[PDB]
C-alpha cells in the first residue's frame, strides 16, 4: 500500500537497464544504422502494438530532423521502394505482422534495420543492420523480470530511450538544435 | 557517439531523481480513482498520445474497462468515469479543451503533467506531477540532447509502467493474467 | 468549368447503388446479422481505405450497443471462439487481412467477408460471404477504372451496404437515433 | 427475411446522390480545386466518421501526387500560411474541427469547409464553403434519422463527393489509374 514498493522496485530495474545499455551498446552498429537512415531515399517505420507507438514516436522525431519518413499502414504513406529503408521494432524479432511486412519490403528490395532484443530472430536474420537492444539481461530470470515488466515492457522502454538517444546523436552530427526541430513540429492540436 | 551516451547519462540521472521524489500519496489517490471509475478514458496529444495509448493498452491487460479519447469504439464519457490527461506543460490546447468538457460532464480527471498549477492541473482531481526538465537543469544542454518534450515523455512513460507494476502487485496479478487479455492477431 | 467527370462519377455511383439493391442476397444479410447478434464481441479489419470503412462500421455497431473492436487498435483484447471477425477486402486477397483472418479462424472465431470476389482466399475461408461488387456486368472496365481507380467503387458500395445493414439492425432492435445518441462519443464533437 | 429497412435505405441513398448531382455548386467545386492545386501542402481533418472520410480523401490526394497530411497524425509537420486545410463536418459545429480550423486561420492557412450547413461556425471561417447536404428539402428529420442516424447521410454524401472530386482532378491532370497505382502503398495489400 502506502510505500508502493513494487512501483519503486520497477524504477530501480529501469535504472539498471539504462546503465546496462550505456555500458553495452554496440557503437559500430549505431553508426551503421545512422548511415542507412541518412542514405535512404525515405524511411519507413513499423511496430505492432506498443512497439508501434515507439515506432511512431521515432518517426515523428525523424520528421522533426528533416527526414522524409512514414509509418507503415498510415494514410499518406506511399509505395516503399528499393531505395528506402524500413525500421522494424520488435522485442522478440518474431512479431508476426512485423516479420511479414519486413519480408515483403526485403522482396521489394528495401533495406531493413531491426531494433530487437534477439540477434538470432526471424526479423534480425532478414536485416541489413541488427540493432540489439535487450529487454532481459544475461543475469536476469525472465519470470522475475516479467512480474514488474510484463509482456516485453523492459524492451519497449529501453528501445524508446535508445531511439531518443539516437536522435540526440543525429542532432549533434547534423548541427541541429531544438529550434530547428521546433520549426517542423505540428502545432494544430498542441498550440505550441 | 558522445551525445548518444551523454543522453543516456542524463536519462539515468532523471530516473534516479524520479525514484527519489515521486509523491507516493498522489500515486495512491490516482490508483483509487482508476479503481473507482466505471470506465477510464485516456488522452494525450502527439508523442504524449502514444504514451496515453501505451498506458491504456496496459490498463486493458490489467482488466480495466478503458478507452482512448477520439478512437473508433470509444463510447460517451459520463459522470461515472475518469479521464487521464497527459501533458508536459499542462497547457496543451486539445487536452485542456477535452478535459474541461469531461469535467463539465462530471467525469473525474487525473492530470499527468510537469506543471502543478497549469491549466490542466487546476481542473484535476488528482495532479500527478512528473517532471521532464528538472529544477535547475541547464536548459541549453538539456534542450540539445532532449528537445521539445523528450524528457517529460520518457519520464511519464517510465512512471506509468511503474504504476502498472504497482497495480499488478496490489491485484496479485502475474504476467500470465495479462497475457490472457492481450491481442494476438498482429503479434502472434 | 462543366466538371463533367465529377458529374459522371455521381451518375455511376447511383447506378451501382441501384445494382446493389436489386441483387442483394437477403438470406446472406440475415446470416450476417445472426452472427453479429450472437457474438460475444465483433472485431473488424480492413487495410487502407477498407480499414477506414471497417472503423466506420465498428463505430456504428458500438452505437447499436454491441461490444466491438478494431483489429490492431489500442484497447482491442484477445479474440476468441465466441467472437466474429468482419473482414473487408475488395479483391479478397489483401495479404494482411487474409493472414489475420486465417489466424482468427484457427482460434475458432467466426468470419464474415465483405468482398467483390466470391472465389477469393478471404471468401473461401469465411462463414458468411457478403459479395459487394466493384465493376458491374455490363460496365466497361476502362471507364470504371478511370473514374473510380484502385477499387473506389467497391469501397463506396461496401460502405453504403454496411450503413444499410445498420438501418436494418436498428429496425429489428426497435432503436431510434436517440438510442444511438446515448452511446456516441462527445468529447471531440461537442 | 425481406429486410425492408435495408432496401429502403439503399433507395434513399441513391436519391440523395441524384440530388447532389443536380444541386452541387460547380463554381465552388472549381474554387476548391484551385486551392488544392495552389497550396504548398494540403492538410485534412474530421472528427470520428468524418475523420475516416478525411483520411480516405488524403490517401487519394497522395496517389494523385499532392503533398498531403492528416491533422494529428505522426509525420504531419507544422502547418503554414501557404497550405490549405480541408475540414469535414456535417453540422459545421464539430468542436475539435472548429478549434483546429481557428488555429489554422490564425496561422494564415486557407480553409475549405465540407459541410451540410452553409452558415455554421466552420463555414463562416472558410475561404471555400463546399456545401454537401445530408437532408433534402422535403424530407422529414424523424424519418431520415431512423434510416440514417447521426449524420450518416451527410457522411456518405461527402465521401461520394470527394471521390467524384478525385475523378475530376484526374481528368484535369491527365492522370490514369496506372499513375495512382505507381504511388499507392503495397506492404499491407500485396
UniProtKB/Swiss-Prot annotation, chains C, D:
The UniProt entry, under Pfam families, shows: SIS
Q: Which residues form the SIS domain?
A: 32-175
Kindly give the SUPFAM superfamilies that the UniProt entry links to this protein.
SIS domain
Q: Which domain of life is it from?
A: Archaea
Q: Which InterPro entries match?
A: PHI/rmpB (IPR017552), SIS_dom (IPR001347), SIS_dom_sf (IPR046348)
Q: Which Gene3D superfamilies match?
A: Glucose-6-phosphate isomerase like protein, domain 1
GO molecular function list? carbohydrate derivative binding; isomerase activity
State the CDD domains in the record: SIS_PHI
**Biological process according to GO:** carbohydrate derivative metabolic process
**What family does the Swiss-Prot or TrEMBL record give for this protein?**
Belongs to the SIS family. PHI subfamily.
Q: What is this protein called?
A: Uncharacterized protein AF_1796
Amino acid at each position: 500500500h502506502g510505500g508502493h514498493m513494487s512501483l519503486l522496485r520497477f524504477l530501480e530495474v529501469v535504472s539498471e537497464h539504462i546503465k546496462n545499455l550505456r555500458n553495452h551498446i554496440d557503437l559500430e552498429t549505431v553508426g551503421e544504422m545512422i548511415k542507412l537512415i541518412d542514405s535512404a531515399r525515405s524511411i519507413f517505420v513499423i511496430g505492432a502494438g506498443r512497439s508501434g507507438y515507439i515506432a511512431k514516436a521515432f518517426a515523428m522525431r525523424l520528421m522533426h530532423l528533416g527526414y522524409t519518413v512514414y509509418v507503415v499502414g498510415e494514410t499518406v504513406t506511399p509505395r516503399i521502394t528499393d531505395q528506402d529503408v524500413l525500421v522494424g521494432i520488435s522485442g522478440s524479432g518474431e512479431t508476426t505482422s512485423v516479420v511479414n511486412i519486413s519480408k515483403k519490403a526485403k522482396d521489394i528490395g528495401s533495406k531493413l534495420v531491426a531494433v530487437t532484443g534477439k540477434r538470432d530472430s526471424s526479423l534480425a536474420k532478414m536485416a541489413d543492420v541488427v540493432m540489439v537492444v535487450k529487454g532481459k539481461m544475461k543475469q536476469e530470470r525472465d519470470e522475475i523480470l516479467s512480474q514488474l515488466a510484463p509482456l516485453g515492457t523492459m524492451f519497449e522502454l529501453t528501445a524508446m530511450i535508445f531511439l531518443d538517444a539516437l536522435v540526440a546523436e543525429i542532432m549533434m552530427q547534423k548541427h541541429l538544435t531544438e529550434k530547428d526541430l521546433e520549426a517542423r513540429h505540428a502545432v494544430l492540436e498542441e498550440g505550441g
